[PDB]
Amino acid sequence: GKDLNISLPLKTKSIAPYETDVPVKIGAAESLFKTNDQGKIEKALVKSYHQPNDTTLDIELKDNIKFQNGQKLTAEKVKSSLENSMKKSDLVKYSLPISSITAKGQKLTIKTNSAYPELVSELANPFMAIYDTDAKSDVNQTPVGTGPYQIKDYKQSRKISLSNFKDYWQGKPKLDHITVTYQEDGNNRVRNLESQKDDLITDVPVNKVQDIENNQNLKVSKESGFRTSLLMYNHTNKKMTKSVREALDHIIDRQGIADHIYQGYAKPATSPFNDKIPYIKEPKLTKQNIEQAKMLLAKDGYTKEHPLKIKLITYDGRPELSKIAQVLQSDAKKANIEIDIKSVDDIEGYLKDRSAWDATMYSFGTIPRGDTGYFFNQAYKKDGAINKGDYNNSNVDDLINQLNHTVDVKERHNISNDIIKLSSRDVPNSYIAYNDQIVAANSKVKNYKVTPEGIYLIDYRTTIE
Numbered sequence: 001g002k003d004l005n006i007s008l009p010l011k012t013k014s015i016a017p018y019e020t021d022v023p024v025k026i027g028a029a030e031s032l033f034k035t036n037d038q039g040k041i042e043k044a045l046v047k048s049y050h051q052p053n054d055t056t057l058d059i060e061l062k063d064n065i066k067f068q069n070g071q072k073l074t075a076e077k078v079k080s081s082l083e084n085s086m087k088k089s090d091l092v093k094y095s096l097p098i099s100s101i102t103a104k105g106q107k108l109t110i111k112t113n114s115a116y117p118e119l120v121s122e123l124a125n126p127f128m129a130i131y132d133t134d135a136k137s138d139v140n141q142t143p144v145g146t147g148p149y150q151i152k153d154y155k156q157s158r159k160i161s162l163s164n165f166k167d168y169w170q171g172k173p174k175l176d177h178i179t180v181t182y183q184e185d186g187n188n189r190v191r192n193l194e195s196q197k198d199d200l201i202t203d204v205p206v207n208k209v210q211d212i213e214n215n216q217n218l219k220v221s222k223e224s225g226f227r228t229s230l231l232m233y234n235h236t237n238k239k240m241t242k243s244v245r246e247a248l249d250h251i252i253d254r255q256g257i258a259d260h261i262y263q264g265y266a267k268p269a270t271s272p273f274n275d276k277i278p279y280i281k282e283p284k285l286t287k288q289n290i291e292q293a294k295m296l297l298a299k300d301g302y303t304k305e306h307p308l309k310i311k312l313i314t315y316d317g318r319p320e321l322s323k324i325a326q327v328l329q330s331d332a333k334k335a336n337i338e339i340d341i342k343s344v345d346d347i348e349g350y351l352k353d354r355s356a357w358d359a360t361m362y363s364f365g366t367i368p369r370g371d372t373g374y375f376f377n378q379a380y381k382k383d384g385a386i387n388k389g390d391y392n393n394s395n396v397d398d399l400i401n402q403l404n405h406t407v408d409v410k411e412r413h414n415i416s417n418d419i420i421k422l423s424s425r426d427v428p429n430s431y432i433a434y435n436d437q438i439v440a441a442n443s444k445v446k447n448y449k450v451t452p453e454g455i456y457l458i459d460y461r462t463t464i465e
């Protein structure tokens, strides 16, 4: 009727907002701040804020906002939500170095111990979305947010059912119900769309784009965005030496991957960050060189008779990753590396066992809110939430720590580029492509978001005509 069916990759376990960005994506939860369609930070739940000095953030919340259970969004509710998320999630904790929070009425004051200029930016992170900590339901199954669609039922790792919250603060939402089901295989997501089992899908495989564009019942939307595919190394395994990481870096053919695997919907990568960001100084592009890789591997004693063995993990959710793994395996054999590819259904859970993998295909949104700090703190610091391979170098740590208290924006750019230059020498990961996000829908579905941060999808204006 006005019911919308969505098919997404990357199944979740908990759907607490501090465990996954899914509740923000599907319209259930909202953070204090957001980014707009051009990627700039804006107030969302906040009416006004001020920073009287470099350790104090004063916020006044909007006065007309309710949670989906009818409770008012007050400063006390925001305090308890943020404190709970800090306690329950390392990602949230390491992004928000908050020393205290005080609340009265609609006003809250957030303090830090020292200057952290990216604090407001990180309050736009979907993992910091606000939920009602006093709700008498399990936040891991049916959290209660302020968004336009309330989660009514969750079948773990399979299906989320949401219903219109009529008193949504920005206006009455335009759909009656949304059903989200997980499907990891992109070809299956496309088949579900073509058969009308689903109405909106994300992460469309590039080789299906033409088939969908050809269909007059469907439409495809693409956004270049800020997501990077990569080969991530497990630094806790002593065999993954600098020579080995450099060898693998030279077996990748980034230009060929962008042209033939992504069919032009990606550009070859050097650093984590898309080269379209104008202040980023990218390292030199590595061109494939099998002879160089063989020479590097000989440094550690590997030969055709005694090759390096690598267990490489992959997953289906981002559909080009496993196509890249196959061609890495074929080419690596020419350089005396035998790669065994293991495709897994739950990538984040699988990689927690650091004895079970040598390298993994991976993807990540490296600059979702306009600053490089988030990525460096989460991917290049020990215990950072996306640093699955435990990369850490004290010299890089020092620069990241300096960046965190640096207010002057041009100085932040300079330190960021120094971190890129120093870290690149270690080959912490091999960044492969800056690739577009491709979303497809039935033509009757209108006003979903396909914007550069790669997080938002559903809002109170999304509809079916």
Ligand SMILES: N[C@@H](Cc1c[nH]c[nH+]1)C(=O)O
Pocket (backbone or CB within 6 Å): 010, 317, 318, 347, 348, 362, 363, 364
């Ligand atoms: N960060 C990886 C793996 C992941 C699973 N769920 C969320 N992320 C990706 O987005 O492709």
Ligand SMILES: N[C@@H](Cc1c[nH]c[nH+]1)C(=O)O
Pocket (backbone or CB within 6 Å): 021, 363, 364, 365, 366, 385, 386
């Ligand atoms: N799937 C999102 C969010 C995430 C957090 N951790 C892993 N993934 C991304 O890769 O950017």
Ligand code: NI
Pocket (backbone or CB within 6 Å): 363, 364
């Ligand atoms: Ni992810």
